[PDB]
Amino acid sequence: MGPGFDFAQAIMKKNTVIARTEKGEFTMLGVYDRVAVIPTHASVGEIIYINDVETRVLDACALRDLTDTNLEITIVKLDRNQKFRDIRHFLPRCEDDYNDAVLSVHTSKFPNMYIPVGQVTNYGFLNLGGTPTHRILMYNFPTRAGQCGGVVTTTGKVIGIHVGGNGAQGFAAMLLHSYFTD
């Protein structure tokens, strides 16, 4: 409906796939080459389904900060025959607060779904499902089961992936440029 949704749609159409693990279906953001991200609670194994195709996982890393605290981001390299468009120049370099963000989801359950979530706080520490987690962004939207992996964007920036909620607020793990230096 506006430039926020326009940027969000451009990322969804070219840089997302539907990832299925034994823990469910997730929006998965492709970042560059065959490298993608997914919330760590997806429990990626040796084989993942990508758009319902059986796919070998060439490598997977659950990120933690230098305090050895969970960040809830898993970086996955996929044995896929096609590269993602490189979107690393849209990733923020530093932890920050944001105005006017969109959370975008694409699964069997929620196809072509775009939620304007408004202001995004750099929340920092969150006990997420019992697990101490750092670099959490928070938005005041009642997000629901099925939105995990959803992409958070502002005009011009891809800032996080949805990892939880408490019924009133939603929480995303930051994406930072430094995660994807090759």
For ligand U1X, the binding residues (CB under 6 A) are 143-144
3-state secondary structure of 145: coil
**Set 25, 41, 106, 162: catalytic member:** 41
Q: How far is the CB of 181 from ligand U1X (least distance, A)?
A: 34
Catalytic-role residue among 25, 72, 106, 134:
72
| Per annotation, catalytic residue among 25, 106, 134, 148 | 148
Provide, rounded to whole angstroms, the least separation between the CB of residue 99 and ligand U1X: 21
- Measured CA to CA in angstroms, residue 81 lies from 30, 37, 107, 127, 172 at distances of 13, 18, 22, 38, 29
Nearer to ligand U1X, 19 or 115 (CB): 115
Contact residues for 38 (Cβ-Cβ < 8 A; gap 6+): 19, 21, 26, 28, 44, 74, 76, 149, 161
Question: Coil, helix or strand for 89?
Answer: helix
Residue closer to ligand U1X by CB (options 107, 154) is 107
Least Å distance between CB 139 and ligand U1X? 12
**Cα–Cα distance for residue pair 101/158, rounded to 1 Å:** 10
Alpha helices by DSSP H, the chain: 3-15
Q: Which two tokens stand for residue 109?
A: 């359950």
Q: Which residue is nearest to ligand U1X (CB)?
A: 144
Is 106 part of the annotated catalytic residue set? no
Annotated catalytic residue 41: yes
Residue (152 or 176) nearer to ligand U1X, CB: 152
Q: How far is the CB of 27 from ligand U1X (least distance, A)?
A: 12
Active site residues: 41, 72, 148
